Paper text:
HIV-1 protease (HIV-1 PR) is among the best-studied enzymes in biochemistry.
The degradation fragment 2 displayed only weak inhibitory activity, with a Ki value of 3.2±0.3 μM. To investigate the binding modes of compounds 1 and 2, we co-crystallized both with HIV-1 PR and determined the corresponding structures at resolutions of 1.6 Å and 1.4 Å, respectively. The structures were refined with two inhibitor molecules bound in alternative orientations related by 180° rotation with 50% relative occupancy. Interestingly, the positions and conformations of moieties common to compound 1 and 2 as well as their interactions within the S2 to S2′ subsites were quite different. In support of this hypothesis, acetylation of the free amine of compound 2 led to a major increase in inhibitory activity.
Numbering used by the authors:
A (entry chain B), B (entry chain A): 1 to 99
């Protein structure tokens, strides 16, 4: 779909059998989700944003279905104010900016 | 232009007579720039991101030319890692997401 930006670009996702809403975020290099119990192995990681940084758990090769388009990639999980779909997954669903 | 997301969506801006590069950021409600000496009145403001928050100066009705398209709006100025063009200005240049 084509999405205008008068409101936040929130979409429904399904990940790890759970339904969530997440922001399509072209400023984010990586995907960062609120605390959830993704199964399997991981690696602690530090990421920085406006405000400073947070500690996250890095999960690789995780399936996410982002507005009905499947993608597999790294998902960081941690103390975020908002679930963020970053460019690592946006590129897999074919997302572009246009003006 | 149409912009893919394999790299950061950086564009050239001109603001306050100065040339800068900024990120087209659909996840940001507001526009936040690194410290610069925008002339005129303003109001101190707190904004939150990943990591916590920062204090900024809020400047209204500031002209910015974002990849050649003019826009006027609020610009927050403060201690950001990266210059961010948020939706307040993206909507003025007609920016959409597409997949
Ligand atoms: C993987 C990313 C999440 C990454 N850690 C991250 O925060 N990138 C941001 C750019 C950046 C990079 C390094 C250091 C500082 C800032 C851009 C994201 O697009 C972020 C998304 C966002 C996160 C939290 C709350 C609101 C937006 N944008 C954002 O800070 O615009 C600024 C705001 C405007 N109003 C409230 S904050």
């Amino acid at each position: 779909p084509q999405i205008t930006l008068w409101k936040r670009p929130l979409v429904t996702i399904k990940i790890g059998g759970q339904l969530k809403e997440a922001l399509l975020d072209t400023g984010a290099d990586d995907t960062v989700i609120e605390e959830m119990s993704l199964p399997g192995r991981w690696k602690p990681k530090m990421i920085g944003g406006i405000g400073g940084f947070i500690k996250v758990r890095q999960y690789d090769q995780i399936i996410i279905e982002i507005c009905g388009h499947k993608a597999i990639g790294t998902v960081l999980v941690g103390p975020t104010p908002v679930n963020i779909i970053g460019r690592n997954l946006l590129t897999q669903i074919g997302c572009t900016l246009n003006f």
